[PDB]
Amino acid sequence: ALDIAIIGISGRYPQARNIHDFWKNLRDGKDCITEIPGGFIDGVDQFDPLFFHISPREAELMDPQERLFLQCVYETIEDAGYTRETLGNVGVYVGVMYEEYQLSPASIANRVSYFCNFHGPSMAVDTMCSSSLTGIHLACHSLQRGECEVAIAGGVNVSIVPGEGVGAVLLKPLARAIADGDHIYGVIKGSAINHGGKTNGYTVPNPHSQSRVIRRAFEEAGIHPRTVSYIEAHGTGTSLGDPIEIAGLTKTFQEYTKENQFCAIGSAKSNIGHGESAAGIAGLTKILLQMKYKRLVPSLHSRTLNPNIDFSKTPFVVQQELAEWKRPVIEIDGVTREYARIAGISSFGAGGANAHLVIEEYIEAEHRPPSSISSKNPAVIVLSAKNKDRLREQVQRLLSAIREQVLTDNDLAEIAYTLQVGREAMEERFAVIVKSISELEAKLTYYLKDEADSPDLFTGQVKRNKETMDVFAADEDLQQAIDTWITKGKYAKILQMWVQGLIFDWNKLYGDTKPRRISLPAYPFARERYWL
Amino acid sequence: GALDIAIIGISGRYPQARNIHDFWKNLRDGKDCITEIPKDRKWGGFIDGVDQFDPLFFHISPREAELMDPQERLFLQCVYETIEDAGYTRETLGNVGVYVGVMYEEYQLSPASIANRVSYFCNFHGPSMAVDTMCSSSLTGIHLACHSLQRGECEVAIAGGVNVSIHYVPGEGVGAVLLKPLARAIADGDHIYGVIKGSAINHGGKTNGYTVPNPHSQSRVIRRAFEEAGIHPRTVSYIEAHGTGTSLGDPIEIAGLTKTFQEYTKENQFCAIGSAKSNIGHGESAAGIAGLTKILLQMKYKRLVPSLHSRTLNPNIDFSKTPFVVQQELAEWKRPVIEIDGVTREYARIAGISSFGAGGANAHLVIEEYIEAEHRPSISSKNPAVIVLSAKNKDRLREQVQRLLSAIREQVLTDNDLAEIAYTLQVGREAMEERFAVIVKSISELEAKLTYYLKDEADSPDLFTGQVKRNKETMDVFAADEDLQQAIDTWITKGKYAKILQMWVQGLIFDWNKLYGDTKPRRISLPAYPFARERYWLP
C-alpha cells in the first residue's frame, strides 16, 4: 500500500481564482465554460515577480505557465502550513504540454526547484491528458523508494472544448504526516499507469488496457472495487470514446462483484472543459473537496442520459443532484462492514497513456487540541507581507477566512501555529496577542480601519532596523535573554521586537506536542500583468 | 538493492553517422562531426536525412508521414532498430516501458506522441511517456525506466532521446537503448553490452542565479548513484562529463566530481575523462543519451577514444590536482588492478556519466562491463546453419543480403558465431512478404551464397526465394491443423531443412525454437532492416 498523504493543495481553474471559489462553482453546479475573454482562467499573465526575486524582464520572458505554477506551488506550500525552508529534499513533478512562446517547459518545475531550494528530482512529464496524473504516480513512487522526503506534483495548461487551469499538490508519506501533525486532505492508496498497445487505430483507446490499469491500481491499493463510492471519469457524456471508458471500468468491476448501480460517477471537465493536464489535477482536486465537505457534486449537462450508455447494467450512477457522500455499509464475502469514502480517478491520454489513482479519506485515530488558550498562555497571531498593501490584504483575507470557514477558540492554537511556522517572515509585519477568536477578530478589524495608533497591536518593519536586530542574535548571552523572555511569558516585548526584525524559534514557546496546521489563505500575490 | 539492469540492445543516429558502427568509426578515429548547415535546411553538428522515412513499413499513410514530426519518425525507426539489435521482435517481448527525453522545437505550421507512437506499433502495454528536463532529459528518462524495472512495473524498458534543429555549439541526434534485468537477460542468453548498476537524479536549488549550476548538487547526485551501485569510486576507470571543459562553468563540474571522489580516495590522475560533445556538440537530450552509447562502445571494443579540442580548456582546471586524466590518444582500456583496504584485485571496466540540465536537473549513471562466467562453444553438414532473411519487397531484401555480407566482413564473424547468426535471424527478425533463405555449414559457404544471390542470377538451388502476397489460403491450412503440425514437427526432428525452407519462403509459420531441443544459443548484434529513405516534409 502506497499510503501517501496529501497535505496541501492550490490551483486556479476557470471562474475560480482560488480553491474555495472552485468548490463554490462545483457545489452550486455552475457551468464555467464562458466565452473567450471554452473555459478559461482569470489573469493568465498575472504575476508578482518582485516577490520571487525576478526581474520584470525575466517575468515577461517566463512562459505564463512557469509563472502561474510557481505562484500555485508557493500557494500549496503555504496552504499546507510550511515554508520553503522547512521541508526535509523535495521532488517537483509537473505535467504540461503547451509551453508556446517566441524568441523549455522543464523551467516550470526547475524554476520552482530553483526558487525553493528543492534538491529532489525536478522534471516535467508529458503524456497528453494523463500528463497530470502520471506526474503524481511518479512522485508517489519516488516517495515509496526514498528518492525524496516530500514531493510536489501538479499540472498547468494555458492555451493561446478546451480548458485552461493550473494546480498543484504536496505529497508526504502518511506515517510522517500523522507524526508531524499536518492536516491531511486525503490518502493516495494506489496508482497505476500503462499503455494500450496496437489498438484498432491510433488515438483509439483499448478498453482491455483501461480495465487492466484500473485493476492494477486497486490491487496496489489493496482495495476491493465494491468499497468504491465515486469515480472521477476521464471524459464527459458526449465525448466520443466515453462509452469505451465506462465499459472498461465495468469489466474490471465485474471480476470482483456483479452488483450494479452502487458507485457514484462524474467528471469535472463538464464544468470547466478538458484541460488535459489541468484536467487531471482538477479531477484530483474535485475528489479531495468532495471528501472534505462530505458531498457528491453533480457533473453538468448529464441530464437526459445518453442512450449509448445504459448505466443500469453497470455499478455506476451519474450524480445529477448535490447529495451527501455517506460512508457505505456493505456485505462482501459474508462480511458486513462500514467502509470509508473511497474514490477512483481516471485520465486516459489521447495517445494511449492511461492512468488511474485510488484515494481514501483520512480519519484521525486520536488527537484533539484541548483549547490551551488562556490569559496565562495566549495565542500569538502574526502576519507579514512584502509591503503594507499586501499586509492589509492579508489581514482582510484572514478575517474573511475565519468567517467563511467558521473557526473557533479551539483552532486558535492551530491558527497561531500555522501563521507562525507556515508563513515566511516578510518585510512589513503585524502581530497581536489574543485569547478568543472574537478578540482576534476585533484586533484585525481595528488594524483594518485607518488608525496610526492601536492597543496591544504591534506593527513594524525591517527596512529600517538591520545592524541592531542583527547584533542581537549574534551573541549567546543576549540569546539567553530572549529565551528567558519566552519562559517568563513577556510575549508583548517579544512581539514589540519581532515586528522590528528579531527572529526566534516559535517552537521554543511550547516544549512539546505542537498543534495541527490548517488551511489558511495564501500570500495575496500582486496581480501585475506581463505579456510583452 | 544493487540495481543490476542490463543493456541488451542499442541503436542511434548522430552527426556524420547514420549507423552505430559509423559512430564508433568517427569516435575511434577522432573525427570532428561539426559540419556547417547542410543544404536541405551558423555552425553545429547535424544528422543526415531528417526527412527520411519508410511509412508503409509502419502501415502509415504518406500524408500522415508528412504530418509526423521528424523526432517521432526517427525515434520510431530507432526503436525498431534497437529491438532488432537486441535480437527480438515486437511480438516476442514478455508489457514494455518507453521513456524518451526530448526538447520542444515543434514547428507545426504534443511530444508525448514520440513515445506513444512507438508503444502503439510494438503493442507495448507498459508505461509510455516523455521526460522533460534540459539536457538531463535523456539521462533522467533512463533513471525512471531503470527504477520502473527495479519495481516490476514493466518486464523490460526502452529509454532514449532525440534532438532535431531547424533554426556554445548545437548538436542533433537520436538514440535508444533496450533495458532488461541482468538476471533474466543472462538467463535468456541475450548479448549484454553493459550493466547499469547505479542511477541518480536531483536538482541544484537556489544557486547564485538561475541557470547557474550548483557543484554540491552534482557531487551529491554522483554519490547517490555510486551508493546505489555499491561501487567504490577508485575502481572507476572512465567518466563521461557533461561539459567540454571550455564551457564557462565547467570548472564547477570538474571541482564537483573531484569533491565527491576525494571522499572515498585521495589518489589523483587515475581515471580517464572525456566528453562526446566535443565530437558532436551540445545536443541537450540527444547528447545525454549519446554519451551512454559512447561508453558502451568503448566497453565493447575495449579501448578508450579521444576527446577533441583539449587545448582550449580553461587553465582554471589544473587536472594535475584532480583524479582525472583527459584521454588524448586512442588507447587500450585494460582492466585496472587496485589495492583497496589491503586487498589487491583486478576490477572490471567501470564508468560514470553525467548530464546536467541548464535548469538544474542533474543526473548521473554508473555502468559496469559484463563478464560471462560460462564456457562458450556445433555447425557441420550433419547439423547446418539455417540462415533466413526477409523484407517487405525485393529492393530491401537485396539491401539486406548486401548489409549482411558487409557486416559478416567488417565485424569478422566465424564458424562459431554461425549458430548465433542463424538463430538471431530466425527468431529475432520479423518474417516479411519477400523471403530468402540458405542452408550453410561454414561462414565461407554463407558468404559465397550471399554474394551469389546478390549477383544477378535468375534461379539457383540451395538458394530459396519466395513471396507471401500470392500464397495465403493454402499455406494457412498447415498451422490450422493438429495432424499437419505434428507432420512439420517430424520434418524438423528429421532435419528436412530444405523442404522446410522451400515452404517457409512461401509463408509457412512454425516455431524456429523447435530446431534446438534444449539450450538454445545466444543472440548478437546483426544489422537491422534497411529502412527506405523516402523524404517527407511540409510546404
Question: What are the DSSP calls for A294-341, one per residue?
Answer: TEEPPPTT--S--TT--GGGSSEEE--S-EE----EEEETTEEEE---
Q: Do A152 and A169 meet the contact criterion of CB atoms below 8 Å apart?
A: yes
Closest by CA position to B119, among listed A112, A13, A351, A50: A351
Contact with chain B for residue A351, Cβ under 8 A: yes
Three-state DSSP state, B430: coil
Closest by CA position to A62, among listed A158, A155, A162: A158
Query: Searching chain B, which residue's CA lies closest to the CA of residue A91?
Result: B202
Name the minimum distance, in Å, from the CA of A198 to any CA of chain B: 5
Q: What is the DSSP letter of B512?
A: G
Residue with cell 538493492: B1
Residue with cell 538463430: B423
Which of A98, A119, A191 is the best mutation test for B, with the most CBs of B within 10 A?
A119
Contact B132 A126 (CB under 8 A): yes
Q: Which three cell numbers stand for residue B163?
A: 534532438
Contacts with B128 from chain A: Cβ below 8 Å: 127, 195, 351-353
Query: Searching chain A, which residue's CA lies closest to the CA of residue B108?
Result: A100
Round to whole Å and give the CA distance between B529 and B539. 30
Q: Do B349 and B235 meet the contact criterion of CB atoms below 8 Å apart?
A: no
Q: Residue B49: which residues within 8 A CB-CB, separation 6 or more? A: B18, B533, B535
Size of interface A-B (CB pairs under 8 A): 155
Contacts with B204 from chain A: Cβ below 8 Å: 113-114, 119
Dihedral Cα B52, B54, B55, B57, nearest 10 deg: -160
Query: Residue B111 burial by CB count (10 A; 0-12/13-18/19+): exposed, middle or buried?
Result: buried
Contact A131 B151 (CB under 8 A): no
Round to whole Å and give the CA distance between A387 and A100. 34
Contact B134 A212 (CB under 8 A): no
Residue A219 CA, distance from chain mean position: 26
Q: What is the DSSP letter of A162?
A: B
Query: Residue B351 burial by CB count (10 A; 0-12/13-18/19+): exposed, middle or buried?
Result: buried
Window 75-104 of B, Cβ < 8 Å to A: 98, 103-104
Name the minimum distance, in Å, from the CA of B124 to any CA of chain A: 5
Round to whole Å and give the CA distance between A362 and A183. 9
Burial B266-298 (b: 16+ CB within 10 A, else e): eebebbbbbbbbbbbbbbbbbbbbbbbbbbbbb
Which helix (H) or strand (E) is B499 found in, with range? helix B497-504
Round to whole Å and give the CA distance between A275 and A38. 10
Count of CB atoms situated within 10 Å of the CB of B164: 22
Contacts with A212 from chain B: Cβ below 8 Å: 125
Contact with chain B for residue A115, Cβ under 8 A: yes
End-to-end CA gap in chain B: 53
Closest by CA position to A9, among listed A109, A198, A136, A110: A136
Contacts with B357 from chain A: Cβ below 8 Å: 106, 110
Contacts with B134 from chain A: Cβ below 8 Å: 104, 106, 110
Q: Residue B279: which residues within 8 A CB-CB, separation 6 or more? A: B26, B27, B30, B31, B32, B33, B45, B307, B308
Q: How far is CA A524 from CA A40, A55, A396, in A?
A: 21, 19, 10
Which residue of B104, B125, B201 is in closest CB contact with A209?
B125
Window 134-163 of B, Cβ < 8 Å to A: 134, 137, 140, 144, 147, 151
Round to whole Å and give the CA distance between B525 and B421. 9
Query: Searching chain B, which residue's CA lies closest to the CA of residue A120?
Result: B202
Three-state DSSP state, B228: helix
Contact with chain B for residue A220, Cβ under 8 A: no
Name the minimum distance, in Å, from the CA of B78 to any CA of chain A: 18
Contact A97 B113 (CB under 8 A): no
Contact B113 A351 (CB under 8 A): yes
Q: Do B230 and B343 meet the contact criterion of CB atoms below 8 Å apart?
A: no
Round to whole Å and give the CA distance between B323 and B273. 9
Resolution of the deposited coordinates, in angstroms?
3.1
Q: Do A192 and A356 meet the contact criterion of CB atoms below 8 Å apart?
A: yes
Q: Which residues pair with B248 in a beta bridge?
A: none
Dihedral Cα B209, B213, B216, B219, nearest 10 deg: 170
Window 385-444 of B, Cβ < 8 Å to A: none
Which of B90, B114, B128, B137 is the best mutation test for A, with the most CBs of A within 10 A?
B128
